[PDB]
Symmetry: D2
Subunit: 509 residues, 4 copies
């Protein structure tokens, strides 16, 4: 019976500036006349509302308006750009509950995590305000008398941002706050299945830009599929392409960007491992493992996919994790009791079922889960599988679903090697009390991941540090440390200010 938005139960969606049909293009003015997409709530498969995506011609026009906006934007001092970013942070803060609710409704993650995602954007904005007075390179001492030597950083220009479904607000945010602070203009193509969240966020940002008499095209949005995404990847006018998504798609995009010598920031797949040693605090391990695997229905890029247990504690730990799995409250994402919601799409359910099959075929035993739940929505049981070899093809594959593969190990050398043997390289954790092991894990013969944690799971990450992975995860970094450098171009500048002339070396002038 109709779109959710038309029902009174859902009229809070109107506070986000959303309607039955929504324009999917913003570039200072709203529009869009491409394919009309209908966004479904994964909790009950009911349609929420529609978004009209961009045509290539509308993308084309958006890039021109963006390029033009950059001209005036790049001329605004960085601390003054930070003032804009600060206000974006505040505008978001005001709408945190309803925006969090939309994320929960459209993506499927629990309400508190929807709110948490909005907070990530808010917090990275405040961080960026700090950076706006800091970004730059060293003044260096030249070897030449009467010469100044400085390292300059400047905006790359336009930052294209392609994001994944699972974090429809935060990923954009992490990129937006930094890119803006760095004097760039953004163009955003969110995941096709979360266009309402894209529009809602763009609405909040657009209003701030407009309050401040700035061209709206500084933060443009064009919703669409591979369609538009490919155009961005091939577009010479896109100075930096930030891609967050599958490692399969990322590769296609990377190759296209490389082809035209563009800059890229790649945030791709993970196959994240928790390694539990004999001396680990098991009272810490068990809840850590559960929440890291089960959270967001196994749909964070940082979700634990591989749990390696030392032979001495293997059977005891598995059983305890299994006892916890039984108490994982599955239900409506809006319900404060719910810890675990639906998978994002029906295709996701199919991957889940297929991965279950392959696991069995490869010698896996199901400890629990494995079945599609008999109810509205894309609900599947959180699954634990023991018995597979460390290099079973399915274990080496990222399947974006709540399945946890349990591995049994003996030596430290083994576990470390198995952690590293896969093609992904996002996140990693060991649980241990051993001082030497901690630093070995952190050193050159330890983990090969971008995130390397000790006694905290694979999803433990904060704004202050650089976020991203290695190998097939793509190399890119977001948010903390000197991540900003990816959004700017370095120039090594020598200024001769002396009256000294170069040696004539035999020639008369």
């Amino acid at each position: 019976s109709g779109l959710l938005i038309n029902q009174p139960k859902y009229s809070w969606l109107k506070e986000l500036g959303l309607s039955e049909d929504n324009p999917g293009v913003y570039n200072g003015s709203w529009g869009g006349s491409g394919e009309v997409i209908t966004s479904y709530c994964p909790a009950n498969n009911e349609p929420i509302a529609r978004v009209t995506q961009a045509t290539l011609a509308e993308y084309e026009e958006t890039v021109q308006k963006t390029r033009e906006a950059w001209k005036m934007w790049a001329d605004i001092p960085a601390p003054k750009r930070g003032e804009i970013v600060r206000q974006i942070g505040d505008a978001l803060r005001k709408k945190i509950k309803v925006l969090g609710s939309l994320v929960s409704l459209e993506m499927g993650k629990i309400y508190v995590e929807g709110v948490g995602e909005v907070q990530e954007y808010v917090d990275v904005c405040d961080y960026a305000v700090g950076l706006s007075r800091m970004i730059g390179g060293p003044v260096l001492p030249s070897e030449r008398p009467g010469h100044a030597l400085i390292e300059q950083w400047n905006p790359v220009g336009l930052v294209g941002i392609i994001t994944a479904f699972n974090f429809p607000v935060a990923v954009y945010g992490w990129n937006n706050a930094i890119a803006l602070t760095c004097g760039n203009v953004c163009l955003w193509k969110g995941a096709p299945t979360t266009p309402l969240t894209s529009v809602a966020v763009t609405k909040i940002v657009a209003e701030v830009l407009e309050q401040n008499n700035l061209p709206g095209a500084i933060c443009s949005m064009t919703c669409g599929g591979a369609d538009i995404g490919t155009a961005m990847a091939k577009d010479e006018r896109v100075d930096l392409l930030s891609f967050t998504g599958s490692t399969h798609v990322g590769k296609m995009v990377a190759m296209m960007v490389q082809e035209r010598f563009g800059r890229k920031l790649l945030e791709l797949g993970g196959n994240n491992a928790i390694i539990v040693f004999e001396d680990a605090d098991l009272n810490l391990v068990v809840p850590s493992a559960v929440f890291a695997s089960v959270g967001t229905a196994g749909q964070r890029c940082t979700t634990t996919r591989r749990l390696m247990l030392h032979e001495s504690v293997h059977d005891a730990v598995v059983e305890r994790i299994a006892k916890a799995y039984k108490q994982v409250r599955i239900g409506d994402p809006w319900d404060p009791s719910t810890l675990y919601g639906p998978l994002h799409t029906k295709q996701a359910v199919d991957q889940y079922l297929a991965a279950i099959e392959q696991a069995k075929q490869q010698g896996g035993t199901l400890v629990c889960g494995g079945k599609v739940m008999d109810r509205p929505g894309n609900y599947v049981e959180p699954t634990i599988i023991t018995g597979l070899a460390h290099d079973a093809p399915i274990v080496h594959t990222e399947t974006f679903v709540p399945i946890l593969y349990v591995l049994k190990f003996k030596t430290e050398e083994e576990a470390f090697a198995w952690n590293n043997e896969v093609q992904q390289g996002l996140s990693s954790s060991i649980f241990t009390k051993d001082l030497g092991r901690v630093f070995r894990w952190l050193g050159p013969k330890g983990s090969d991941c971008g995130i390397v944690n000790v006694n905290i799971p694979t999803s433990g990450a904060e704004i202050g540090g650089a976020f991203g992975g290695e190998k097939h995860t793509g190399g890119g970094r977001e948010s903390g440390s000197d991540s900003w450098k990816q959004y700017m171009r370095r120039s090594t500048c020598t200024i001769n200010y002396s009256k000294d002339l170069p040696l004539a070396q035999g020639i008369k002038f």
Copy 2:
């Protein structure tokens, strides 16, 4: 007339450990059984000596010996690796004259510049010794009580280095010193036309490694053509590929490395512009322009290719540069009088003649030069061409030859735009006395190059700063600032050291 090396006039070549035939593979032991190449002296087209290049199977075996060497090398503390780099610096210092002489003989650049190139390696070694006690990331304050947060840097593993002909010692050096300091092992494939220099350098480095009882494979070398170069680009065991060469070849290599998610450092073509404004010190401009254009026979990646003169000074400056060109002493590279030697190959001579032709077809007038010199060796006249449009196809192309294209401009906006309009983005210079112009040139609406100079030519660059370009020049950086980061992998590490347990949130454990 035989090989030069057999003649007494050239027995100093034996001090570099060189013989009639030379092994082109080193990996802890010397060998090679691939194609035998004969290295010619471009000053007289006489054969110097031969080098036996690697077979794929010998490359293959070198990669395994390299990987094995890394194991022990990565375990050596960075300051202690720096001690090795220090000694390489000193070993080079002892052989500076003869090695400089070999560069001059085999590449074709003047003796003093051959010596200067060796000095670059020496100086970057001493710089690396400093870095060996410095490399690393920040300790960061975690938002979580009882949690440490640190940024760790670790060796990427094996660094493949492919170098160009024009700087056969320095480019390898810049990479070697840094990579070694950073706990990596190197594999070097030098330009096919400079294998004797490759071998000579490798010999010097090998001896130091051996004096210190270190596996020689830490600094491996396999000489060869596209053959081996492609193998490296495709090899998953090469953790970072550093490529210095043409932007055409770089692309092929880049695409191959991207395909397999490897790390790349790209140091490609340039189309470097000097912009002379009305208020410029012409007594500084004239000698600067001459030496920057004519030096190394127009064969530095940083060589001035485009000289933009303000209409008010155009005709006066061109004429003065032309008067200087007449006094450029052309001769034997070994001869201390010579300022200008031969082009590196005969093919180079053909590019030169072809570019002359295209320049004429596109409306160019030859101010001077343009003719192959009637004498032994690959000698061509240093050429100046006026009258071409800023966007004449030939002007936008890097031709690695001593031709200088002269452009006439009026507005600052014009000159800046023309500097940026090309696909290359290595080096750039303006000559002016205007305070505001200087900073605009350095800012966001100024030069888009990696090197952005004021009142010093396009080849003004020192160790202390990052070296490299933007756009089609490839993005890579060498030597100074935080260039070292490209040779290492970042990991964001969170250590939970507290006894705190995570909230149970309704679940009983």
Copy 3:
């Protein structure tokens, strides 16, 4: 005619939580039973309201409560402390107008500048939020195998802050935001003549701390004179004393802190010089000079005291500045476009008159001003004096009053030397178009000040950079760059995590 606060025209003072009598001590609870001081409005010499200052015993008790608060505060992660600092920023933002108005009423500076001062605190808070995720030292590579080497930064403990009258909000703010972010607790003794501003600020901060269930003693205040100030200087429990004030008082305090090996941050006197060269843009010079000299009635520590004019432009510039001085409209602190108010106290008026007489006795000629204005308040005429020798005793003295001493120079060497010859070393400016001169001025044979400006006056300074002087100005730095390090203690930490034992060297164990 009673207290101003009791009159309806001034009831906005009640919005700041102010009353007829006000407690001058806060340490989690309010009080004070020392001397009752009456704060006068320097615009009309009318009493505003009273503040009860601290007794030594109440200072004593405040230090204990502060030390106790630190225990819990130091345990809170830096980003979480930044969240507190963020809220202080916001709380201030809400009260910006009334607080600015109080500064204007109690100190005497114009309304817009009162508001500007509050903004400084607000902006430094947002800066500190950035720092809260950044502060720390490098992870360093140890020369010892299996050893970690890190630089740790930790709170010094309690930061005592003694501030001057002229910036009663901002100076405290610059210190508060950073110290808090760095895990310190603060104790504030503001200038005796601005206790209402001290209380008002403390009230705003106290409320934020209390909203967040934090001990109020984290930001303690004890109002008083030299009395309390000396106690702080001598108190071993004060880990860092930040002193902003006269260089005469600063010295006494410094000596006392040195005596007990405490840490000190000194922000003392200035004798700031503007040097105008022949090629300067005079249309820029004239307004710059006027506003830098006349602003805040010559009562900024950065105020231009010495204006050095090249002989060629001397008489023309003086006359133009004089024409501008005539249009400097004296009005009332609040008001619309009042550009100039009263001196802070009557004693200030006496210094002004005495400095005038000494100037005359030392050969000075009054171009304008010099007379006490016949009206309510501490109003004096803005004065220009020509003819004095560069080393006339009065010129070398900081008199905190709106007198501008004009010097005539010829050579660059002269001007630079005269700038440096004084004992103060806060701020300095040159106005010129000469590229070489700019960098000479910035280099080792240029200015010896902490602030070294080009084509901007002596009061040009922003949050992003470190603020402070050299020589008799005291060495301290506030706000930007790595100023934070003064508020923390560095520790060089080596962690041995290996099983390696030290060489027995002949001894059996």
Copy 4:
């Protein structure tokens, strides 16, 4: 019989350029006509040779020559200054054995440690070479359009260096290498009892300066007592005074420098504690404790003075350390068998005997040692004392002698507090396997020292990190991290390069 230098067994002293009488002043030329001091070998109380110290008038003249040398030296680019530092490093390297031998002969430490000290100078030189291309501040983004903002670092001028007896080469070296790299000139007053080492070093440095046609006054030396030292402390021409010595003398010097607003670097006393917890590796603890206490005859500023043992391991550990003490080979410093030489002076022996007395009076029991050894030289037995209270006056005092006070503790809180309770704050160590304890020790409620070590003793320190202490140790830092900043002055520079004029705000110009 007679001076040692005249005997053939000691003619290697002539290789250092030493003679019977030696000039104690160098400032480009050698001389000195003050008090003639005779330097005695503490191993046999035999006179080595004489040095003629400076008169005040000769100090005075040396300061003028130094100031004059600075003019030309400050004009030399930092990397080119580093080239000088590099050569100093090499000149030292050539003389390492004989210079090490002199340290051993004149100070009394064992030969291998004399050599090690020279190596510290050599290694810090190479470090400084790296820094010579790195030193400087950030380029910062200004909030003002068309304004550049940069942090500049410049030489302070002349660095006065006053050193202690115990490290007569290295302390100077650590200061020399950095100060020179930073464009300062040095004046050195070494300890009165080690003037031959001072002269020998100065000779090596002087030669390098002269080889390079630089004024010798860049590295001046004036030998003398409190006499000259006080003059330096009071001298306004000394821009920075670096003092290494007793905390008693340091205070006098500090107070004098503070009085005249000079810069100071203080490296004073230590009372260094090793804390051994229950879970410590005792096989590591015992040899660590022995060597850290007994090394250099207890005469390093980092020497372990306090050993805190957990009650559970106390009696076992003391006994094991005592068994090791018996095997400590006491003898001639020149003999390769010797691990432990003489105390530096006879007064030192008296302090030792007096501290023994006070320890007994305060309830201490001698485990071993306590007696003057019956032999030539200042030899005393290495002493261990148990039973004293943590706050026994003698334990809180630094006595520069080989006595180790053993404390028994129970709680972690206790040990940490006892470590911090003293007025010194140089070095500290804990021995433990507990992950949480390690980071608590490093954090805000851990050690309050400048050096904070884990599982390595109190003398574990390397070039890469900043070296120095807190509290009564004086705050100064040497060598690593950003220690260099203490040798330079910061300037925050704003450059307005736009044509923009400031708002007229009602005034017509």
